[PDB]
Design a protein around this ligand. Structure first.
Ligand SMILES: Cc1cc2nc3c(=O)[nH]c(=O)nc-3n(C[C@H](O)[C@H](O)[C@H](O)COP(=O)(O)O)c2cc1C
Ligand code: SF4
Ligand code: SF4
Ligand code: SF4
Ligand code: SF4
Ligand code: FES
Ligand code: FES
Ligand SMILES: [Zn+2]
Lengths: 79, 244, 192, 119, 434, 95, 62, 56
């Protein structure tokens, strides 16, 4: 598991004959379960920031690059 | 390990050679080397702003501060002579906290004009700020500013970006031989200039563009033409004179 | 308006010549006799202050060049020395430069209620010489424990290097400053 | 030159007879850092460029216009020499110029001139 | 006694004529006792003088508090061609200091004899007295005393008729507070900008003109000729064990009758204030804070002003300093934040601007202090003050950065409730306005 | 099952003359072997009960012009039964 | 007025009167929509030019 | 689109920070010092046949 996939509830569809029809039923079920995961993500999405705070690896805010010297240096070096 | 930049240490005699521990590594240096030079022999490259190997030592910027065991306060490695048995420490929290303090002080009155600075992709200030500096600035008050002065048709001058390392003054006094440039004033209001309106007439006056670690001194003919990353570097020789 | 650079003006420009005096050459020799002949640069401050006294309380760019010639250094060194120290006036001060605004210890006892009264009495801003050319206003360097906070320093450049006197006056009322300035205008010197 | 690898590589025969320079790029004069040092590069001496007469862009017809600067880098002189030897390129080696650490002390700024000599 | 440290009889005082009641020139100097058998003191050898100074336990009176005899022992004993120099540091520019001026305008010959004695004890060939530039009248008085000394043969070739050749010169500054520092003074005296040097080259090996030299305060130099004559055992019998002697105090601030007085080295601060000077204005209850030793040293609140000894070590254990021993008494009728902000402005104005932490840190400290002077700051700004002060301390070339950082730390250490109170009060006047 | 278990098991069970470099980290447990033992190692790692690696994810090459053996061939492997990944690398020149 | 180049257009805007010795230029009324902050020292006789905007600032009284 | 200030001055300062981030190398910029001394572009051309419209 990666990201928050281990905090979400969804089933894994498994086939029985291996033919083209099972690949289709599973391709239906994987999309119903994707709808389920989307609903859970919408309901449980928290508040906060959307990027890592290590601005040595992430771009500064456009209001901070035009107001702080180190933020402008980080922007210049990153871009 | 090898010295930084393949530097060659000339031992006049094997007898006059002290031993130091740069990071727990045994390093042999002649009597007379400084802590910074001893670290350079041991492959460790210390940050520097005001130290130039061809200019006299002047511990202004306080950026090369390291930790010495028998020292209550960090020492300027550029000026501190190496002693036998001395244990230097460069990657300790003390040396770090000193370096992010000094970078924070240096980037406090510096203008927010990296995009228009001709030193954009080749500045020592921002390169060391990324590496040895911090991430967030705590300064919000009004910065200082100075007017720009004409030094001739070769050196473009934007003195708001000066970090006051006095390398240009030392070069003019020692290497160029034409004493026309100096540090004027006292305190945060100190400025580099000629006081009177005069132009740099030395034949070696253009070398102040390179010794300047920031974009305070830049070439006027090569103003805004291109950035360093756009340029292909060819190692060639001179044909203008017989020096080559 | 203390600036770290010089703009050429009719009053002070490098073209104007400046030697000391017939009377002041003995002082120049005596000053230079205190240091080894190979270290004549060490006599830059006692020569710059002498030039300031002789010229009338201020240092034109010609005086700095003359001092550089006397001590045989580049004129940039003399500019560096003159700009660093706060007792060297590079602008043009009046005949009796008056030093008013205080420092840390004195304001606890009230040193910042003395400047405006005089400023509006003589009616020109700080660093501006009156029309007749007698008086000027500047910031003092407080010298002692400052028991009597309202102190004013009177730099006298009327008689040049022969009648220059640097006095501190203690406990001077915002109207007693007017009294002492009126006394100075006539010519008499108040006691301290 | 045993340029057998050049023959079994796929490089056209015209580009296998190029003359290259093996050198170690030096430190730039505008920076005091010494991080981009110790790496060896092969310079193909690709200078045949011109100007596009529609937009002023720089046109070229040399495939080895940026290879030695972008991708082909070596950690030592021997590696670059072996690479050139196996690819059949006529090479010349430029030894790098290295700085010499002299004795410098802060006290030399403040040195006695000597007794005043009336010479 | 050891239990009762304080109170000098008029006989045991060193600086007689400290009030200007008698002639300060050569006549009074000889009648008072100056220049008395100085030939005997110089004809007893350099080593003997240093031994006596070491036995007397004379710590430096310039603020640092370094033992004088051990400092003099650092001078070269064999001349290698470089002449040795003595430099008397008379450039007192600290606010609220009145000592060296009173010494050189009332006892010039004590200073001259001290220069001669110290030059003999350090094998120095010349002495430069560096006077503050504002002391024009004091400079003229010292020059007249120098002329009188030279005319009487007490100085110059064959000083006091003893074979020692000592020359005394009077250099003066031009209004810079940094020029009082040991190496910045040497820079100023060499004809350059008064910017301090780095320490690894020590003045005892490379000082004035690249030659070995020693920089000493006026008080340390002035008491030297009388320690030898009266006896180190007499001098060492005042004050505590390690730090002993008699030191001048310029008591100022909110006290009834501020004055300058000489008292034992271990005089209690409360007894000092309430005995020589009057009681604190409005009583000892009105007391709020005392600056122990001038601008450089940190602050001490009332609770620890009780039973504190005015010592180099006692005040240091209280995380303050004796400094120049110039107390500045502050009552509850003064805003301490205003005072500390003004100290920040003074240190911003007097920084030479050579090294990065002091050139920029002092200005940043002043701006933050000005903002908090009216509460125009957040509660999380006080910690940034501590961080900035710790970033300034220990990274500067000289001790002016430390002296510019200590007052803020003292304010934060004993008056944080006041800063938070005014910040909250400002915030309330903003929430209740719009 | 895990990098801590697979490393210790393969240390003991594998013939020593096959593998000459064993890095154990969080980026991936790697095995570096000679080119004349690659098939033997991969056949052992496909049939052994406790190291049932039945999926070959991909085969990639990496070019190192500064090395004598210029090319590095990497075999990323996957074991579905024990939920573990193994990476096996060899080195070969142009001929 | 396409005949006027941006140089001639920025050369026609009168300099802004500032009372103090220093002014901060951001380039727009909303700081986030302009150029990085630029502090300009007004201690000369000629108007001082912003290196981003081209706007000129001159000291008002002294 | 290249924007200009409300005063009529073009906002581009020839920093070439967009030419170095362009993943498709679709931008070519030539700059020099203008008669006023300001840092401006003489040539600023974009290849829309190379542009990937990424917004970098
Ligand atoms: C900023 C600064 C100013 C100083 N001002 C003085 C001064 O005015 N007088 C003085 O005796 N020492 C002053 N000192 C201390 C000097 O270092 C002094 O010469 C040295 O401590 C020797 O003092 P001593 O004579 O007591 O041994 C100052 C130090 C600093 C850092
Ligand atoms: S000198 Fe360096 S940090 Fe300063 S504006 Fe120019 S590129 Fe940026
Ligand atoms: S102009 Fe450049 S070299 Fe000269 S002091 Fe300033 S930053 Fe240093
Ligand atoms: S701490 Fe301040 S006064 Fe001392 S050298 Fe540094 S800048 Fe100058
Ligand atoms: S060169 Fe590109 S990034 Fe720089 S100002 Fe012009 S459009 Fe913007
Ligand atoms: S490089 Fe040593 S203090 Fe600047
Ligand atoms: S503040 Fe001016 S003499 Fe006291
Ligand atoms: Zn602007």
């Amino acid at each position: 598991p990666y990201d928050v996939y281990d905090q979400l509830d969804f089933d894994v569809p498994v086939g029985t004959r291996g033919d083209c029809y099972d690949r289709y039923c599973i391709r239906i079920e994987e999309m119903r379960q994707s709808l389920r995961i989307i609903v859970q993500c919408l309901n449980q999405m928290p508040s906060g920031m959307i990027k890592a705070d290590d601005r040595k690896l992430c771009p500064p805010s456009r209001c901070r690059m035009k107001l702080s010297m180190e933020s402008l240096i980080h922007h210049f070096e990153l871009y | 390990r090898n010295p930084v930049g393949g530097a060659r240490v000339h031992f006049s005699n094997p007898e006059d050679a002290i031993e130091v521990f740069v990071d727990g590594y045994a390093v042999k240096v002649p009597k007379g080397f400084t802590v910074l030079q001893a670290c350079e022999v041991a492959g460790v490259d210390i940050p520097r702003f005001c130290y130039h190997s061809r200019l006299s030592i002047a511990g202004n910027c306080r950026m090369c501060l390291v930790e010495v065991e028998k020292s209550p306060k960090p020492v300027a490695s550029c000026a501190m002579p190496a002693l036998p048995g001395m244990k230097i420490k460069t990657d300790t929290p003390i040396a770090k906290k000193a370096r992010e303090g000094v970078m924070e002080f240096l980037l406090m009155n510096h203008p927010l004009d990296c995009p228009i600075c001709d030193q954009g992709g080749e500045c020592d200030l921002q390169d060391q700020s990324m590496a040895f500096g911090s991430d967030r600035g705590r300064f919000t008050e009004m910065k200082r500013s100075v007017v720009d002065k004409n030094l001739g048709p070769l050196v473009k001058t934007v003195m708001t970006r000066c970090i006051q390392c006095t390398r240009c003054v030392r070069f003019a006094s020692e290497v160029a031989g034409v004493q026309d440039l100096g540090i004027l004033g006292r305190g945060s209001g100190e400025e580099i200039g000629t006081y009177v309106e005069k132009l740099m007439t030395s034949e070696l006056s253009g070398n102040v563009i390179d010794i300047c670690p920031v974009g305070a001194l830049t070439s006027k003919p090569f103003a805004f033409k291109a950035r360093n990353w756009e340029l292909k570097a060819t190692e060639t020789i001179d044909v203008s004179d017989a020096v080559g | 308006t203390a600036l770290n650079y010089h703009l050429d003006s009719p009053d002070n420009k490098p073209d104007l010549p400046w030697e000391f005096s017939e009377a002041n050459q003995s002082k120049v020799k005596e000053i230079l006799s205190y240091y080894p002949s190979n270290y004549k640069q060490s006599a830059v401050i006692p020569l710059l202050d002498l030039a300031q006294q002789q010229n009338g309380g201020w240092l034109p760019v010609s005086a700095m060049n003359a001092v550089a010639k006397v001590i045989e250094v580049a004129p940039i060194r003399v500019y560096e020395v003159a700009t660093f120290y706060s007792m060297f006036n590079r602008a043009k001060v009046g005949k009796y430069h008056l030093l008013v605004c205080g420092t840390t210890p004195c304001m606890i006892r009230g040193s910042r209620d003395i400047e405006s009264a005089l400023l509006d009495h003589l009616g020109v801003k700080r660093g501006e010489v009156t029309k007749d050319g007698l008086f000027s206003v500047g910031e003092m360097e407080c010298m002692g424990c400052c028991v009597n906070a309202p102190m004013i320093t009177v730099a006298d450049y009327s008689n040049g290097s022969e009648g220059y006197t640097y006095n501190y006056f203690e406990d001077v009322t915002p109207e007693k400053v007017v009294e002492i300035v009126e006394k100075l205008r006539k010519g008499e010197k108040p006691p301290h | 030159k045993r340029g057998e690898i050049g023959k079994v590589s796929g490089i056209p025969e015209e580009h296998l007879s190029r003359k290259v320079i093996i050198y170690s790029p030096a430190r730039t004069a505008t920076q005091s850092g010494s991080g981009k040092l110790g790496k060896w590069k092969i310079n193909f001496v690709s200078t045949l460029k011109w100007e596009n007469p529609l937009m002023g862009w720089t046109s070229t017809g040399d495939p080895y216009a940026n290879v030695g600067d972008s991708a082909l880098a070596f950690d030592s002189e021997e590696a670059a020499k072996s690479f050139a030897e196996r690819h059949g390129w006529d090479y010349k080696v430029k030894k790098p110029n290295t700085p010499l650490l002299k004795v410098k002390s802060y006290s030399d700024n403040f040195k006695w001139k000597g007794n005043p000599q009336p010479e | 006694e050891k239990t009762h440290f304080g109170g000098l009889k008029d006989e045991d005082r060193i600086f007689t004529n400290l009030y200007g009641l008698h002639d300060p020139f050569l006549k009074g100097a000889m009648k008072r006792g100056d220049w008395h058998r100085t030939k005997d003191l110089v004809l007893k050898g350099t080593d003997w003088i240093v031994n006596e100074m070491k036995k007397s336990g004379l710590r430096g009176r310039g603020g640092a508090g370094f033992p004088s005899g051990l400092k003099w022992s650092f001078m070269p004993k064999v001349s290698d061609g470089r002449p040795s120099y003595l430099v008397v540091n008379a450039d007192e520019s600290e606010p609220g200091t009145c000592k060296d001026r009173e010494i050189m305008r009332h006892d010039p010959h004590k200073l001259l004899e001290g220069c001669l004695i110290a030059g003999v004890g350090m094998r120095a060939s010349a002495a430069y007295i560096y006077i503050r530039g504002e002391y024009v009248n004091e400079r003229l008085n010292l020059e007249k005393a120098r002329r009188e000394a030279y005319a009487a043969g007490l100085l110059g070739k064959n000083a006091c008729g003893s074979g020692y050749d000592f020359e005394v010169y009077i250099h003066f500054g031009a209004g810079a507070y940094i020029c009082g520092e040991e190496t910045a003074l040497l820079e100023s005296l060499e004809g350059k900008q008064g910017k301090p040097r780095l320490k690894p080259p020590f003045p005892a090996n490379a000082g004035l003109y690249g030659c070995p030299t020693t920089v000493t305060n006026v008080e340390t130099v002035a008491v030297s000729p009388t320690i030898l004559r009266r006896g180190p055992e007499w001098f060492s019998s005042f004050g505590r064990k390690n730090n002993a002697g008699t030191k001048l105090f310029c008591i100022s601030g909110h006290v009834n009758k501020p004055c300058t007085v000489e008292e034992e080295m271990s005089i209690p601060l409360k007894e000092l204030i309430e005995r020589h000077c009057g009681g604190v204005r409005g009583g000892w209850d009105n007391l709020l804070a005392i600056i122990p030793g001038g601008s450089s040293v940190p602050l001490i609140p009332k609770n620890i002003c009780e039973d504190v000894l005015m010592d180099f070590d006692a005040l240091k254990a209280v995380q303050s300093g004796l400094g120049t021993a110039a107390v500045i008494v502050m009552d509850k009728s003064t805003d301490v934040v205003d005072a500390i902000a003004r100290l920040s402005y003074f240190y911003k104005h007097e920084s030479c601007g050579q090294c990065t932490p002091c050139r920029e840190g002092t200005g940043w400290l002043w701006m933050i202090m000005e903002r908090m002077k009216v509460g125009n700051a957040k509660l999380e700004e006080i910690d940034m003050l501590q961080e900035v002060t710790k970033q300034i301390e220990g990274h500067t070339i000289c001790a002016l950065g430390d002296a510019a950082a200590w007052p803020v730390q003292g304010l934060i250490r004993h008056f944080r409730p006041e800063l938070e109170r005014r910040i909250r009060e400002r915030a309330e006047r903003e929430l209740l306005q719009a | 099952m895990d990098n801590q278990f697979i490393f210790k098991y393969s240390w003991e069970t594998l013939p020593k003359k096959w593998v000459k470099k064993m890095e154990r980290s969080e980026h991936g447990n790697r095995f570096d072997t000679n080119t004349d033992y690659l098939f033997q190692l991969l056949c052992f790692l496909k049939l052994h009960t406790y190291t049932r690696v039945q999926v070959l994810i991909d085969i990639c090459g990496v070019d190192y012009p500064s090395r004598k053996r210029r090319f590095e061939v990497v075999y990323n492997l996957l074991s579905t039964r024990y939920n573990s990944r193994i990476r096996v690398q060899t080195s070969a020149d142009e001929v | 007025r396409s005949k006027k180049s941006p140089m001639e257009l920025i050369s026609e805007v009168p300099p802004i009167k500032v009372d103090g010795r220093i002014v901060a230029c951001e380039g727009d009324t909303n700081p986030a929509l302009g150029h990085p902050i630029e502090f300009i020292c007004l201690d000369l006789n000629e108007p001082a030019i912003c290196k981003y905007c081209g706007l000129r600032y001159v000291q008002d009284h002294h | 689109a290249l924007r200009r200030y409300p005063t009529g001055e073009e906002r581009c300062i020839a920093c070439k920070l967009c030419e170095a981030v362009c993943p498709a190398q679709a931008i070519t910029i030539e700059a020099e010092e203008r008669e006023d001394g300001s840092r401006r572009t003489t040539r600023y051309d974009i290849d829309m046949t190379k542009c990937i419209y990424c917004g970098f």
